[PDB]
Design an enzyme around this catalytic site. Sequence first.
Site, PDB file in Angstrom:
ATOM      1  N   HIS A   1      51.013  38.780  38.322  1.00 25.77           N
ATOM      2  CA  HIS A   1      51.079  40.376  37.964  1.00 25.77           C
ATOM      3  C   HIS A   1      49.737  40.903  38.218  1.00 25.77           C
ATOM      4  CE1 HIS A   1      54.530  38.637  36.063  1.00 25.77           C
ATOM      5  NE2 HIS A   1      54.416  38.108  35.196  1.00 25.77           N
ATOM      6  N   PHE A   2      49.529  42.029  38.000  1.00 26.79           N
ATOM      7  CA  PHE A   2      48.526  42.767  38.138  1.00 26.79           C
ATOM      8  C   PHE A   2      48.258  43.336  36.762  1.00 26.79           C
ATOM      9  CE2 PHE A   2      45.282  44.754  40.710  1.00 26.79           C
ATOM     10  CZ  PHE A   2      44.378  46.086  39.324  1.00 26.79           C
ATOM     11  N   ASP A   3      47.248  43.000  36.177  1.00 31.40           N
ATOM     12  CA  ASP A   3      47.060  43.767  34.649  1.00 31.40           C
ATOM     13  C   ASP A   3      46.094  44.778  34.145  1.00 31.40           C
ATOM     14  OD1 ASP A   3      47.903  42.978  31.986  1.00 31.40           O
ATOM     15  OD2 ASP A   3      46.209  42.879  31.802  1.00 31.40           O
TER      16      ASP A   3
ATOM     17  N   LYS B   1      56.349  38.499  45.083  1.00 30.44           N
ATOM     18  CA  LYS B   1      56.577  39.615  44.296  1.00 30.44           C
ATOM     19  C   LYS B   1      55.563  40.751  44.249  1.00 30.44           C
ATOM     20  CE  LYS B   1      58.814  42.372  40.476  1.00 30.44           C
ATOM     21  NZ  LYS B   1      59.916  42.456  39.915  1.00 30.44           N
TER      22      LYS B   1
ATOM     23  N   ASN C   1      50.598  51.702  39.895  1.00 32.39           N
ATOM     24  CA  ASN C   1      51.266  51.035  39.819  1.00 32.39           C
ATOM     25  C   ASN C   1      49.718  50.531  41.018  1.00 32.39           C
ATOM     26  OD1 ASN C   1      52.843  48.066  41.163  1.00 32.39           O
ATOM     27  ND2 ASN C   1      51.817  49.504  42.858  1.00 32.39           N
TER      28      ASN C   1
ATOM     29  N   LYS D   1      58.407  53.682  39.520  1.00 29.11           N
ATOM     30  CA  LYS D   1      57.746  52.620  38.767  1.00 29.11           C
ATOM     31  C   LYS D   1      56.514  53.185  38.325  1.00 29.11           C
ATOM     32  CE  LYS D   1      55.381  48.747  38.279  1.00 29.11           C
ATOM     33  NZ  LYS D   1      54.609  47.531  39.610  1.00 29.11           N
TER      34      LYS D   1
ATOM     35  N   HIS E   1      51.060  44.214  45.083  1.00 31.31           N
ATOM     36  CA  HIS E   1      50.199  44.994  44.678  1.00 31.31           C
ATOM     37  C   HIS E   1      49.181  45.181  46.096  1.00 31.31           C
ATOM     38  CE1 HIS E   1      51.049  45.694  41.065  1.00 31.31           C
ATOM     39  NE2 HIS E   1      51.904  44.885  40.866  1.00 31.31           N
TER      40      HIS E   1
END
EC number: 4.6.1.18
Length: 124
Positions: A119-121, A7, A44, A41, A12
């Site tokens: 995850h991309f923070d 995911k 992103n 979304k 990303h």
Amino acid sequence: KETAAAKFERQHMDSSTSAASSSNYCNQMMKSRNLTKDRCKPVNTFVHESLADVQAVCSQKNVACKNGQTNCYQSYSTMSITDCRETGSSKYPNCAYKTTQANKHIIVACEGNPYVPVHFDASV
């Protein structure tokens, strides 16, 4: 059956381009990566580095995540990224994005064995 790691790659990673192909990049990519399916979304980021380089950030500078968890990591080097941000006039299902290219340090959350980005923070 899509893992968290997969995911993250879908949402990303875009190693193919060195930078934000075009003014249309976010419009195309947010859709093709299925980030506009159930809603637009809002924001992103896509990273234009190798998967190995991004995975390596999990062993780089440990920083606090925005949500207060401890498992975030900041790249020591700057990386080529594209930020996609939904326009004010964007109406689902016709999601519309501003494409901005940058070279910034990325911050990712990592989890698992193997310890990989999930995850991309942020970028800084």
